[PDB]
Design a protein around this ligand. Structure first.
Ligand SMILES: [Cl-]
Ligand SMILES: [Cl-]
Ligand SMILES: [Cl-]
Ligand SMILES: [Cl-]
Ligand SMILES: [Cl-]
Ligand SMILES: [Cl-]
Ligand SMILES: [Cl-]
Ligand SMILES: [Cl-]
Ligand SMILES: [Cl-]
Ligand SMILES: [Cl-]
Ligand SMILES: [Cl-]
Ligand SMILES: [Cl-]
Ligand SMILES: [Cl-]
Ligand SMILES: [Cl-]
Ligand SMILES: [Cl-]
Ligand SMILES: [Cl-]
Ligand SMILES: [Cl-]
Ligand SMILES: [K+]
Ligand SMILES: [K+]
Ligand SMILES: [K+]
Ligand SMILES: [K+]
Ligand SMILES: [K+]
Lengths: 186, 186, 186, 186, 186, 168, 186, 186, 168, 186
């Protein structure tokens, strides 16, 4: 997988809150980012997943986390979808269009026989490093509560070097402090 | 990612319930499988994750799901760990040793500069197809409750073709029925 | 150019009159076909061009000519557009989706830095041979009346070997009959 | 196609209004140019097409447009044809000879089995960029009226960056102004 | 040079006495042939050389010698030339058009930077072997009576093995009979 | 063919009027030259051709034209031949030996399965450019009167470019 | 074999006397070193061999000889083994972990189908040159007494150039002094 | 190393007990073999090593072990050495000459700068498999006592599949029986 | 060197006793052969060497040994030389012409910058195997008495293998 | 052959009059040299040829000719041979050992399937050019008086440019002076 690699440069158009904008890797520097890939606008599982993320978007911004949804549809199409679907209408984050497939291929996430991105989510830290990856099959929707838990764990590890977040970790739970003495003790 | 690809053949030794066994892809045919990679025996986050899975192991077997933990340590070392750690002692599933790294590389999951597998989990259906992927950074433990949700969603989609599991889906929740009419409606 | 070459096999999904269908080269065998490429659903010149062809579609059908519009957008997106645009709403021909870009590249017609097709029109005879090609810049709309003229000239020449259609030819006008005697006399 | 690409350097001899001259890409710089390819002097469709362009030549010169006709015949042969054909006698634009085929291959327009150019027309702007292409089969004459409409649209979009010309557009008719708000409305 | 090599297969259109014909290497089999190459129809040089061959053509035909003039111009252009020039009008042999350059290149006689053939003449026997070659720069006339002399010599040696024709040989002159005793004797 | 190309550098030994000399492309500069190839000393057609050129050599020299005969035999062998044949004894031009075949291959004129040059004649102008080429089969001797005619035409067009008779 | 070649740079983690340290080739420069490879922690022959070297370690240290044991197991695993085995417990030298296999492959000593090192011992002088090599089959334990003999012979030869140690040589015994006179006399 | 690999085919001349013979790999089949390489006849360490092996030769023959000494000198030179050296005179095993170096290169044992073999000993089982290797520097003589211990251990493990020989093992001493229960206990 | 290798197939024209003949490797089968290369007809050392071999040719023929001299000159040239030189006129063995250089290159004996063969002699046994080789510089003539001695030794060891005097 | 080529650099050990020395190409510079190759020391052939050269060595030294015998055996083996054979004991010139085969291959004189040199002798002048070569099969003696004759001839031509030595030449015999008049005269 791409875990612990740096994201690649990119330049894409996007729809965001009634405007077209250009997003590049420069916009992700010094920020936590979620790249949220999905296969197709006007599809079935895709809107429900996007809406799930939109519900959590206030909480994400409070954590200093930006969201970029990505499909290989155009930004024109995202705009159209945003106004015709009640679910998509509530999205306030950037919807990136990736018709060249370049951004999707940067994340090695193309279904080459379809020209559509797989259901993959990448959590990316302020230095561009991928810290968490989730990929599901066409028929299996993701769950934003799991994303948030991973983001919080990722942020904690970043802010507390010498500590690691064990399984199931939530804020307030105990952490492990790697050391020679701890080796084989757990 | 490897989503929607078939697992590759493999042959590895493993520790399971006080015996050494050989596992191959043949043992996964006609079964649901979880391949649970982790970097190192006697490490810190690794045991807590393995223990998390062990807690759920009764529930997994009831779903007809087999678990294979995998590291690049040997099966000798797993056996040693199983008897010295209170957490590992409760593991009843197969602990695979992958010192050649072949099984880990089949899943594209090697940290090449370390000789250790990344924290990756792959859900594999009875036909050998990878249906769900999770990868976390060295410091971020996984959460077995998320795995189980994905397994159940994967099983539902398999058993109900023409239906897909939307975001957040749990047993008893409504599903989507892909069709022309539904396109753009959600 | 691709003039006087045979079209390549293809297989694509399309939206046509409230249905999703599959189109392949077999659909075109024994028929006159127009492959009408455009860059983007929900864009600006594209709808006006497509509406213009729709205005001529009754006549095209009478002449045994099928129309396939093609963009790299999906057939889902074509369905959405067809319902939200009153121009696109009048289209009764197949709207092919080409998100893999394979059909577009068959016709050497991809804008590689955009992942969108150029404004190209190809007239294909029942033997799969390209008899006329028109390509215009992003800002320059095509004119279906000129397309109809070329289709009629191509059909005439197929039905009257030994005759060719001079500049500006329309039905009922003098043709040229190639021969040694005519050489250098015009 | 070669749409939106820059023309290649060339150096060819030509006949123009009773004398032999050299033509190069430098002569096209800062001018609109039409490269009008045809297969063979003394043939049948070819003279009618060239004459049709000659009929429009005064109008073209008024638009700042130079015409270069091109075949793989020599400039000597063009001069002879210009003397013996009443149609060709009317030509006041440069008739380029391309016996090496290099100019023709620059425009990817050679019938390799014949050593003759296909019936292709390229509209080229002052910066050398190809803005419109037309190619027709051996038996299908072109129509200069369509050429002029395309040239005019090309000049209009060049002179009005923020506007595009919809289908059928001619002088005085409504243009489109691409914008976010116009996305999906036509 | 190509002396004593066999001519290569070819298929070209020609103008011959008011008709268009196809010439291939099969037409040369069992015959003596002259391939008379020249650079360009309608050029500014008087075509005295072609005329000189025409003057001698009745005699060449009595000797069973076919003549093929060749340039890279088309057979259409040869027909027009034959109508326009009193000298060329004398030609009753085949005027081959070679716009692909393939026949010219078979004889390694292309000026690649001009797309025109050099001034070369090849004498070819009934088995397709080249028995004499002459190439000259412009203004250096190929004399048809020297061609005839060389043809008669070539026919004589073909009919009299064991004899060779010394310098200046013409019918009625002594020949040489290669032998050991003749070695060093002349 | 090699028409309108520049001759290539070369360096060969030759026999000329009872001496051995070295000939190079520098000897040809500023002069008209005939390179007269033939297959073999002591052979049959070859002497009669060489003798024919010798008959015309005074005339050629008055036209400022040098002659170089060339075969793949050695200059030693040319000397021997010049002594033993009445025909070859008349030759006053240089007889170039080309045993490596390099001069012959410069003119793309080797019979590779024989190691002998073909019967080829090249007329080369003072700038080194090949202006006329004639090649005949093993059995067919050349005619120096045609060579002279061509040389004179070549000199004429060099002196008076584009005085080629117009087309009507 | 690698005899009389220089060791390659390396960088590995090791367990040594309750600490994790880094070992590189720089640690070996200016020292005698024994690189003692074995296939697997918690295995059978490996502990007995390592204990045997430990029995000799006081003497090795007195002679200026360092020992590095190496397997492809991790340094974490070495720590665990050192605490659970009373044999391994007596080891005071560095136990190198080589999970990437790089150190093992430097010495061309990998069992590629197992990902474990072969039973190989390399004696390395202060200039990095390999002076003695022993390799035994999986089931065949080495004998440290023979290793000590070879180390002493190597040290002797380094300290007494012009002398060599004959078969079976131990300290205090006759050496050979190579010379022309000695040639063929033994 | 070459440990656990099969020896390669060879064909060499040898001196043995007063006659010249051919030796091939076929002669080693079904026998234990020692290939005893050394750099040069008439040298210094070499004779003492060969004599040491000769001292053990009766014991080796009793164990069904054949010895082949090998240098890049010829069989002629071995015969001469066997006559003029009191040490070499004692040799009753085959002395192989390898002037092509092929046998030496089979065992990857050539000093390429010298054209002489290194001091390497290979123990080879009846199936052709190399079970023990020893290589020493130019100045360091080997010790046949260690050779015999290794041969005996090799024969023991061959004859007792389920047992391995620990460090220091000699006849009569405790072996190890690999098992799961023995993992980690030593 | 080519020692102990089998000669390669070849086909050349030769002059022999007033006739032109074809020589191939088939002519050498079952016979002892000497291939005697030299650089150039009409030259200096070459005739004296060839004349020396001719002096010994009757003796060679009594030993069942054929001689083939070879240069890159033609067989026409050998005939001329055989007529004009008193030394060469004595030669009754075949004089092979090798203008393509193929026979010379079979014996790896070409001076590539000259197109002439080096002064090499090869003794070839009835099975085609090269048993002795001698090569000398341009300036150094060979000695047929040494050649005869070697041929006789070669015949002796062929007839009586391993009767080489023992080492003490 | 290598006639008239320059010898290549080399560095070999030799036995010369009771000592070991190094010989390189620098030792040959400014000197006449004989490289006398032979297959094997201690072989069953009497070394009469080497003895014959020894017999003539005083004379060769007066002529400033150094002799180097060469085989692929070592200089150790040459020393032993020189002690064991009454014939070889007469040798006071350098006996080069060439176990790498490099000197032998410089002279293209290796029997690759034996690892032994062929029976070749090379005469080399002070500028390193090979002036005479002799190669014979076994039993065909190289005669030292023929070598001397060839050396004296080579020295004579070196001292008298413009003269060459005819067949059978010895001091006092006439030489030839290459000239034009001498061509064809002998
Ligand atoms: Cl990934
Ligand atoms: Cl993956
Ligand atoms: Cl195209
Ligand atoms: Cl694409
Ligand atoms: Cl195009
Ligand atoms: Cl072309
Ligand atoms: Cl040619
Ligand atoms: Cl040519
Ligand atoms: Cl005139
Ligand atoms: Cl090794
Ligand atoms: Cl590895
Ligand atoms: Cl090894
Ligand atoms: Cl070797
Ligand atoms: Cl040789
Ligand atoms: Cl050659
Ligand atoms: Cl004897
Ligand atoms: Cl050689
Ligand atoms: K797309
Ligand atoms: K490992
Ligand atoms: K042409
Ligand atoms: K050797
Ligand atoms: K020659």
């Amino acid at each position: 997988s791409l875990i612990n690699t740096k994201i690649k440069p990119f330049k894409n158009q996007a729809f965001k809150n009634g405007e077209f904008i250009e997003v590049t890797e420069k916009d992700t520097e010094g920020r936590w980012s979620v790249f949220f890939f999905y296969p197709a606008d006007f599809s079935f599982v895709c809107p429900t997943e996007l809406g799930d993320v939109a519900d959590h978007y206030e909480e994400l911004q409070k954590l200093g986390v930006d969201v970029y949804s990505v499909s290989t549809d155009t930004h024109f199409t995202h705009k159209a979808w945003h106004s015709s679907s009640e679910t998509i209408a509530k999205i306030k984050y950037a919807m990136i269009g990736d018709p060249t497939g370049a951004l999707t291929r940067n994340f090695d996430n193309m279904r080459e026989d379809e020209g559509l991105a797989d259901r993959a989510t990448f959590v990316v830290d302020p230095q561009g490093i991928i810290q968490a990856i989730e990929v599901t099959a066409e028929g299996i929707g993701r769950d934003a509560s799991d994303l948030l838990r991973k983001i919080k764990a990722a942020q904690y590890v970043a802010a507390h070097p010498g500590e690691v977040c064990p399984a199931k970790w939530k804020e307030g739970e105990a952490t492990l402090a790697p050391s020679l003495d701890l080796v084989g003790k757990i």
